[PDB]
C-alpha cells in the first residue's frame, strides 16, 4: 500500500460522491446522534461566512428542523455563534450565510479581551508570544466559547474538518480541531462546493497567491485525495505535512501506541 | 466478554505492577518519542502539588536529564507550569513537589484574569455561566497556557491522565484531557503511589466525604480496574459514567463511527 493509498484510506476519501445523498448522509447522521442521547438539545457551530461553516451550519439547522417537526420537541435548536477578534464591523459573508441557513439562534461573542488577558499573564510569566502562536491561541479561545455555550445549552460542538484540511494538518490542535461531531468528514473542498451548489447556496460564499500551502494548490490537494498521480513535489509535500501531523489526528499518546515508531 | 473486561482491556490496567518496571517504562517512552522528533527540546506540564502531577513531573524530569547527560543537548528542558486562579497566596504541597522534582524551568500564570474576560464576552452576548461550567473554563485556560508555553518552547504538554481518572470520564474535554503525551496511562490510583514511594517522595504529597464519586471511593475504583468483584451497586454506578463519558475518550465523531449506536 503506498503512502497516498493510506493516507485516503485513513480520511474516508472517494473520487466521486452524490451531493444529495451525502447532504443527506451528513443530516441523518446528525439526527440519530441527537436521537440516541435525547438529554441534548442543541447543536453549536462558529459561523464566520466561510465555505466550510456555512455548509456544516445548513446541514446542522436541516438535522434540528426535521428532528423538532418529527418529535415535537420545541426545545431542539440550532445555535450559531459569530466569534470576531475585535469590535471590527460587520461581514456581509458572514450576514449572507446567516440569510442562508436561517438559524434558531445566533450568538455573538468577541474573544479578543480573553486573548489579550491570556497573553498579558504569559507576558507576567517572563514569556511573549508570537504573532502565529497568538493565531492558535485565538482558536483556542473560540472551542472555549463553543463549549461554554454548549454546556449551558445541552449542545454538542460542530466541527468543520473535511479530508482537504486535515491532510495536512491546517487546523489548531485543541482549538479548530477541538470538537464533538464532524458531518464533513471525508469530503474534500471541491465536494463541499458541490453540496452547497444542491443545496442552493449563493456562489459568492464558496466560488473562488491564493494556495492551500507553498507550491500546492486546493485543486492539487483535492486531486491526491481522488487519487491521481501529481508531481512528484507536490506529492512529496502534501506528504511530508501528513506525516509531521500525525499527532493532531491522533487521541494522545500511551505507551500503547506504535505509530509514531521508527 | 464483560464490560469490566472491556474497560480494563481499553485503559490497559493489570491487577500488579513492578513500580522500577513502570518507572523506567515511562521514563524511557518519553525519552524515544523526543529521539524521534529532535526538533522538540521542552516538556510542559501544569504542576499542582497533587499526586498526578508530582509523579508526572518526577518522570519527565528523569526523561530529560538522562537524554541531556547522552546526547550533550543543553536546550533540553523540563518546564514546570504553576497555574493559580488567582493571586490566592503560595501553597506548600506545591513548593514541596517542586523541591521533589528540581525541575529545570518553573513558570508561573495566573489564568484568572483570562477566564473573568471569558465570562464577560459570554455575558455580553446573553449568556451566564454556571460555577459549574466554569471549573471546565478554567480546565480549558490551564490547556490554553501550557500549549502557548509549548508553542515557544519547540515543547509538547504532558498529560497525567490514568485509568482511576480515566474510567469515570472525570477531567475536562479538552481542558487537562488536552495533552500530547500520556506516561501515566494504564496505571490505578493506589500503582501511581507505589511508584512515588520507589522515586522517594514525600508521603505527604500522595498519603491519603473523600470520595471518587458519589457512593464510589479510590479504593472501589482501584479495586474494580483490578478485576475484582464489587457491590452491583457501585459496578453500575462505575459502568454508568464509563458509558456516558465514551465520547470524551474518542476522537471527534464521524459518519464511519459505530461505537454509539444502539
Ligand atoms: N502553509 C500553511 O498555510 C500552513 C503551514 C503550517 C501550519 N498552518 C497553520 O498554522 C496553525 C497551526 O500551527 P501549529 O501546527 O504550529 O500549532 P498547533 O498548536 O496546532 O500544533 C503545535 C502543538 O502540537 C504539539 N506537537 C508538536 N509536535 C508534536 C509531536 N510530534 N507530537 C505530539 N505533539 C506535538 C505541541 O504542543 C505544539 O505546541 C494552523 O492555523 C494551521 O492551519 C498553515
Ligand atoms: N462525581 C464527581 O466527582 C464528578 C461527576 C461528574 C463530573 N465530574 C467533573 O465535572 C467536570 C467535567 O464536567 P463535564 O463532563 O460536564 O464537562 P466537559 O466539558 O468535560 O464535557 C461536556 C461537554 O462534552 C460534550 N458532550 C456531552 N455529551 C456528549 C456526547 N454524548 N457526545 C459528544 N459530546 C458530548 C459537550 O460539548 C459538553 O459541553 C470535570 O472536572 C469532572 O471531573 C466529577
Known amino acids: 500500500?503506498?503512502?497516498?493509498?493510506?493516507?485516503?484510506?485513513?480520511?474516508?476519501?472517494?473520487?466521486?460522491?452524490?451531493?444529495?445523498?451525502?447532504?443527506?448522509?451528513?443530516?441523518?447522521?446528525?439526527?440519530?446522534?441527537?436521537?440516541?442521547?435525547?438529554?441534548?438539545?442543541?447543536?453549536?457551530?462558529?459561523?464566520?461566512?466561510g465555505q466550510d461553516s456555512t455548509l456544516a451550519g445548513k446541514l446542522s439547522q436541516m438535522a434540528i428542523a426535521e428532528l423538532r417537526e418529527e418529535t415535537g420537541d420545541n426545545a431542539l435548536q440550532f445555535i450559531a455563534v459569530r466569534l470576531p477578534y475585535g469590535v471590527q464591523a460587520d461581514e456581509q459573508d458572514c450576514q449572507d450565510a446567516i440569510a442562508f441557513i436561517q438559524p434558531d439562534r445566533v450568538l455573538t461573542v468577541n474573544i479578543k479581551?480573553?486573548?489579550?488577558?491570556?497573553?498579558?499573564?504569559?507576558?507576567?510569566?517572563?514569556?511573549?508570544?508570537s504573532d502565529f502562536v497568538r493565531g492558535n491561541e485565538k482558536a483556542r479561545e473560540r472551542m472555549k466559547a463553543q463549549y461554554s455555550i454548549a454546556g449551558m445549552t445541552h449542545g454538542v460542538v460542530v466541527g468543520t474538518d473535511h479530508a482537504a484540511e486535515a491532510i495536512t494538518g491546517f487546523f489548531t490542535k485543541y482549538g479548530d480541531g477541538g470538537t464533538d461531531i464532524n458531518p464533513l468528514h471525508r469530503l474534500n473542498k471541491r465536494q463541499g462546493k458541490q453540496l452547497l451548489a444542491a443545496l442552493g447556496c449563493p456562489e459568492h460564499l464558496y466560488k473562488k497567491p491564493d494556495e492551500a500551502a507553498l507550491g500546492v494548490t486546493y485543486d492539487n490537494i483535492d486531486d491526491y485525495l481522488e487519487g491521481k498521480?501529481?508531481?512528484?513535489?507536490?506529492?512529496?509535500?502534501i506528504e511530508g505535512w501528513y506525516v509531521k501531523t500525525e499527532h493532531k489526528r491522533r487521541l494522545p499518546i500511551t505507551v500503547f501506541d506504535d505509530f509514531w515508531k521508527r
Chains 1, 2 share one sequence.
Do not use: C, W
Open 1 to 49: 500500500m503506498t503512502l497516498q493509498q493510506e493516507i485516503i484510506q485513513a480520511l474516508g476519501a472517494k473520487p466521486h460522491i452524490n451531493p444529495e445523498e451525502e447532504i443527506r448522509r451528513s443530516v441523518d447522521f446528525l439526527k440519530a446522534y441527537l436521537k440516541t442521547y435525547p438529554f441534548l438539545k442543541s447543536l453549536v457551530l462558529g459561523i464566520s461566512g
Open 113 to 129: 479581551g480573553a486573548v489579550l488577558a491570556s497573553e498579558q499573564a504569559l507576558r507576567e510569566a517572563g514569556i511573549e508570544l
Open 229 to 237: 498521480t501529481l508531481d512528484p513535489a507536490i506529492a512529496k509535500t
